[PDB]
Design a protein around this ligand. Structure first.
Ligand code: NDG
Ligand code: NDG
Ligand code: NAG
Ligand code: NAG
Ligand code: CA
Ligand code: CA
Ligand code: CA
Ligand code: CA
Lengths: 779, 779
């Protein structure tokens, strides 16, 4: 069963029926003002901080996703009314036809009902901290129709906690005032003229308005049947205290076939409302703004485009996965329909990993996040697990420290410089979160030295509070995953030092890496099962062995052993074969197996989690891409693609009854085989799976990698692929790559020609604006 | 306009029409399990801690109060359905007749609709941590009817924050399982067999059930139209993860005039559900449980009953205000429809004051709270503003310290001992919150000495973080209110030391009191306006003078100057006359006037609050009773009663269109004259106004006061009262007091006879179980 389809031509996902089993959301905004909106227009907006600057309210985890950004239409001749989005009015689907087009940074809502065609495009224009609601109403009947339009948003008290509780204070913390076509919402306790004011304006001159939620909705009514909409007029309410809303009403008389256009604007700051409502009265300004949003993503998408035998891969890499990955880098991980309060700011390991995915498309935001992370690192070398970057924009103890956080930053920084060529970045001085400063280069060394110090007697990195798996708390225990990550980070750093001619560091860290490898190969391999263990308890008991009854095979350790380059080809293939045989499912790779069923605090909280859920036996998406990378390094392209196809949301477009979540977005986890809902996907959008999936496909399957001295092309694809093509923009130059596979192998470059001339190895960075033809023949 | 009436005979408030402009709530429970339920059955339950042990969910501050404890009835012949409570189904009020009877610790819901009579009584039985839903369905039509009943509650994830956010965790933190007539809800991460399990059981053997909210309610539906109820059967869902509910269904066939009875039980702990569903199958056990709830309050009400010319006073004092005051003492201030998360435990000054109100009715809980407060006090002498008593059941700095908190405890402890006679209490050793211990007596001295130390150069108590008025932050500034409170506390302590023969303390504190009085009379009186100022800024500027444009007259300072006994009769009358002339309104006394309009941080946050709202110019209820006490001390009974009648909710039973809130409950504040909603009452139930109102009327207007050596009767009533009668239970003996006012004076005792014998002054405590006739003649 499906509810829509991918429109490759317009780069939109079209939802043909609104009764989806869950809200399918999209993100509006590319700067500071953001909106998480569903296909039913449910959702909310916030400015910069979702926790402290929420703009409109949201009642989460309920059967309906309300409130939202709604437009109610009413036939003033009959009194009949409906919303442009299906919900909240929910007009019968046998009577009204609804369509939703989720695009990159914009969503189009359409409704055709009883002779009236209506469209509403919600998008946050660049350069403004506001959301435009571009509305078009057309009379498609053969008679004169009189239609009234009503807007609605419930203004937030700005602090999420103030919306959820402490109403003894928040109910008297704001007020509304009205001026022609503008409802001004004042957060009375926020003296800032910008941040302390929100508004809902209309390009038309209103017939009526409502600033009080209780008056617009009415007694014992809700968003589904507002009193104002039912009676055909607002009550012109505006006062201080209680709950406020932004409702502007206008009646229109439409001749047969006639159409009108106007806009509503939800925004922040005094003065802006009056300005923008006037600015957008000229619809050409709305079109220009929308055109800038299209350009924004056209520019980004064009920097890496692929044409291959796999339509699913092409569709996702060329738009959707890039979009999801950059959304994570820009908006972080704490504003969705699942993350709705509490945690805010940046998760260290989350953004550290996300930032490695799109430096080719958004180098500026990537650099900004990397700098945030560097500022969020302490002298000791570890990172603050969760912090607000604004705190350090010109501290927890070792007990709350997570052992992997800081290590992910290393490969990410190296990638950023490789991509942009900003080698001077390594010399920039950045202050530590706990005082003092050091160069970016020294920040990196502080991180690597920390992991070398915090190891067990066997030489394996301590899990501390928790490693990648938040539910793996070994403290004094040891994590295979961290040691493998450390090796990967070291290999990346060695190449850097080598490139910078830092001979001493090359020796130091090459030696450090040597010790990590020997320690891992000596203690972490289980030669009975043929794979790498997950780690060891603080008491020295190995976790993840062939003899245990629970949690024998682990995805993170086995995939990272290969991805990091630590494991030999032999152990790599066998470990990954164990992953395929025991963890693979049509929905993706399980995190471990069998699931844990006996609580054991020596292993961690994972033993106290439901089987097939979250970290305990579920298909945790994040690590799946590591498996793809591992397979490319082993030269098994067919295996890699089998893993990719199984997790690719695109291929599950017609099994929504089982998946439930968005077919255009990766999710945090899918219920594993041990849970009765096996197959149901949970938490779309803000998951590092997107950044990693993008990175894995572009850099390892398609094999295009930017480097300190050149561009590398070394693919690992399915043996039956005749070839593929990629357009890659790197450092201001374009590389038109064509890969040919006449002998039908999976990996191995026979030859590479640059502009008709044969070359050996890396493609040297070409002149600015140059277009280069690169032919790669596998063999 | 009214929506109900007081039923004095049954001690219930009868709501005749459910479309009240706001939820009118009641509290179920007297021990640890509590339920805040509305007249529409909306609301939630919690066990001990509302913040960490919520049992069922609540979506606050919305147009509907959901979810709740609902019972849906369905006619299986027509498919028609409705709820016993009006909402959530909301059957037309032209078709169904609804009635709600809120009683003391129980609520009765009734619905008569299309030939079916249904009743549902919700109450928490003593001895169990559960809520009983006693349901009776009667076929009042002339034909055989087939009716199905469905229950519904949405189980909470226990931590309020987990219900409001962090669903990435909470959505996989619980599960449901089913056993005959019992839905078992397991909080998977809470290993305690009692606290980590909830349940919804039924005395009948179910035809179907639902443990999954999404299955019972269905897609794109809510509590108003559950899929299960509409189709006439549950889906028998039960699993781990997602949102859970407790729905048990049973179909009944009823002959004309036939009625059936059964019960649903919402509770906590494994094993209890199976036990109670079986126990209550014998309806006689439900009746016995209900009878225990009636007895519980009959016993308490009988300890103080009044018969006077004022029906409003009688109705409230004899039941409702006692009920509200004890509810505050037992359940604290953080569980209502307004307080729904964040703050939890005990507010120092709040409970310190509440505990002075009902020691005659619930001495055990009073003692418990006093001990909690003593444990919550630090060696320095001040109290922790907000703390959880469980923390200290066998610490903030001076910056977060509120200057009045600890002082309120003094009069309260003295009253407790006067009331119970437990003089040994003063010797009990209690540990300080920050280490060490001392006798109750020394805890008290530590409090008094703190206020003597923290004063300005003029000798007035520093406001510190804030005094009684949380929005009055003077820090180094000085508060008139605190100095007056200090004097009152000192006078109480002096009488105690005198009674205990602690001569040295008598001298010490009598001297301390002397200095406070001289300092107050010298610096706080404004002889131009004729009243006491509110205080002084840190820079020495007086606040509350006749020459200022804003905040000239303040209620707290002027009422406390008299209540404390500090002010002379002359200044007392004039100050209170200023209060009457400038602060009185038909709705009660404003906190100050004129309202502040210019922000000034030297005065406090009150200058940043909307005019006529909260602390800035609103009718803040709490201080009103102090005005009544002040007037009785001035001997102006008519003035006192004018103030009482204006604030008494009872007298506003027919102006709900303006008041909005419960006519049987005091509220935190009523919008003042400066706000357009002047008259609207906000935050019923959990306000110290109830405890103070009860204390003021019983002890000062009716003038009955327990003492260390005797019972005092010295009333101050309206001059036109011919007299009144009071039944007072004190220390195991009963005092039948009859007050006669033949000369029609307001205050002044001509004579008092005890059992026919004339006496002078205090009535010595009589023998246990004795009944004494006390005739007081005013003159
Ligand atoms: C105007 C306003 O919101 N005042 C409230 C006050 O009533 C409440 O007691 C306190 C609790 O922390 O918070 C705020 O100061
Ligand atoms: C099973 C479970 O609830 N795990 C979550 C983990 O996924 C999440 O990253 C972390 C954030 O603090 O909280 C919990 O550990
Ligand atoms: C936002 C956040 O804290 N995400 C965490 C991620 O950091 C962690 O690596 C992973 C595995 O436990 O689980 C996610 O929920
Ligand atoms: C529960 C609570 O903190 N209640 C406070 C009370 O202590 C304070 O004395 C009064 C005046 O400001 O305002 C109430 O809101
Ligand atoms: Ca403001
Ligand atoms: Ca070019
Ligand atoms: Ca449990
Ligand atoms: Ca007796």
């Amino acid at each position: 069963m499906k509810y829509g389809y991918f429109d490759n031509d317009n780069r939109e996902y079209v939802i043909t029926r609104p009764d989806v089993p869950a809200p399918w959301t999209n993100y509006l905004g590319t700067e500071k003002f953001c909106t998480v909106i569903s296909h039913n227009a449910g959702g909310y907006s916030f400015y910069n901080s979702p926790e402290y600057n929420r703009v409109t309210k949201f009642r989460p985890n309920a059967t309906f996703d309300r409130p939202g950004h709604y437009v109610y239409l009413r036939d003033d001749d009959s009194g009949d009314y409906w919303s442009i989005s299906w919900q909240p009015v929910a007009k019968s689907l046998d009577e009204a036809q609804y369509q939703i087009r989720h695009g990159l940074s914009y969503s189009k809502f359409q409704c055709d009902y009883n002779g009236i065609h209506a469209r509403k495009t919600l998008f946050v224009p660049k350069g403004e901290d506001a959301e435009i609601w571009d509305v078009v109403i057309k009379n498609t009947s053969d008679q004169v129709r009189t239609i009234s339009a009503f807007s609605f948003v419930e203004f937030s008290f700005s602090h999420i906690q103030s919306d959820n509780q402490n109403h003894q204070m928040s109910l008297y913390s704001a007020g509304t005032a009205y001026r022609p076509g503008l409802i001004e919402y004042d957060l009375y306790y926020n003296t800032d003229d910008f941040e302390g004011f929100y508004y809902l304006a209309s390009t038309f001159d209103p017939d009526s308005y409502d600033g009080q939620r209780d008056r617009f909705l009415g007694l014992y009514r809700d968003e589904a049947n507002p009193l104002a909409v039912e009676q055909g007029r607002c009550s012109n309410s505006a006062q201080t205290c209680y709950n406020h809303c932004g409702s502007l009403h206008k009646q229109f008389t439409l001749q047969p076939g006639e159409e009108i256009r106007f806009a509503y604007i939800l925004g922040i700051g005094k003065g802006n409302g009056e300005r923008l409502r006037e600015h957008y009265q000229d619809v050409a300004n709305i079109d220009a703004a929308f055109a800038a949003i299209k350009a924004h993503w056209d520019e980004r998408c064009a920097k890496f485009q692929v044409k291959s035998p796999n339509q699913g891969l092409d569709t996702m890499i060329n738009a959707w996965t890039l979009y999801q990955a950059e959304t994570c880098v820009v908006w972080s991980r704490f504003a969705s329909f699942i993350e709705v309060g509490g945690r805010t700011g940046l998760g260290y390991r989350d953004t550290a990993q996300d930032a490695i995915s799109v430096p080719h498309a958004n180098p500026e935001m990537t650099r900004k996040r990397i700098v945030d992370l560097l500022r969020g690192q302490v002298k000791a070398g570890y990172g603050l697990h969760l912090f607000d970057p604004d705190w350090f924009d010109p501290i927890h103890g070792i007990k709350d420290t997570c052992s992997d956080d800081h290590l992910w930053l290393i490969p990410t920084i190296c990638k950023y410089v490789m991509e942009t060529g900003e080698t001077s970045f390594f010399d920039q001085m950045i202050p530590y979160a706990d005082g003092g400063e050091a160069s970016v280069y020294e920040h990196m060394k502080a991180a690597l030295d920390f992991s070398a110090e915090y190891v067990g007697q066997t030489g394996i990195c301590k899990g501390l509070r928790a490693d990648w798996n938040d539910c793996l708390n070994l403290g004094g225990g040891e994590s295979s995953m961290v040691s493998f990550l450390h090796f990967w980070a070291l290999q990346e750093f060695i190449d850097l030092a080598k490139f910078l001619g830092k001979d001493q560091d090359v020796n130091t860290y090459t030696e450090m890496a040597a010790n990590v490898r020997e320690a891992c190969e000596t203690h972490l391999w289980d030669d009975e099962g043929g794979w790498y263990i997950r780690g060891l308890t603080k008491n020295g008991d190995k976790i993840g062995t062939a003899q245990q009854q629970e949690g024998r095979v682990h995805l993170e350790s086995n995939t990272l052993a290969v991805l990091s380059g630590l494991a030999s080809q032999e152990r790599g293939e066998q470990a990954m074969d164990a992953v395929d045989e025991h963890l693979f499912s049509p929905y993706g790779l399980h995190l471990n197996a069998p699931s844990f069923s006996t609580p054991n605090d020596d292993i961690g909280f994972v033993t106290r989690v439901y089987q097939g859920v979250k970290e305990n036996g579920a298909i945790f998406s994040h690590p799946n891409p590591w498996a793809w990378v591992a397979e490319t390094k082993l030269g098994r392209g067919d295996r890699a693609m089998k893993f990719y196809d199984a997790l690719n949301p695109y291929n599950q477009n017609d099994i929504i009854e089982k998946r439930i979540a968005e077919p255009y977005s990766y999710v945090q986890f899918i219920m594993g085989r041990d849970h009765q809902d096996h197959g149901r996907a949970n938490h779309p959008w803000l998951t590092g799976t997107s950044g990693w999936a993008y990175f894995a496909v572009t850099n390892y399957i398609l094999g295009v990698q930017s480097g300190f001295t050149g561009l590398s092309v070394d693919p690992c694809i399915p043996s039956d692929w005749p070839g593929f093509e990629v357009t890659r923009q790197w450092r201001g130059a374009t590389y038109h790559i064509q890969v040919e596979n006449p002998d039908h192998v999976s990996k191995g470059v026979k030859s590479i020609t640059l502009n008709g001339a044969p070359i050996q190895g890396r493609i040297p960075p070409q002149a600015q604006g140059s277009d280069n033809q690169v032919v790669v023949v596998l063999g």
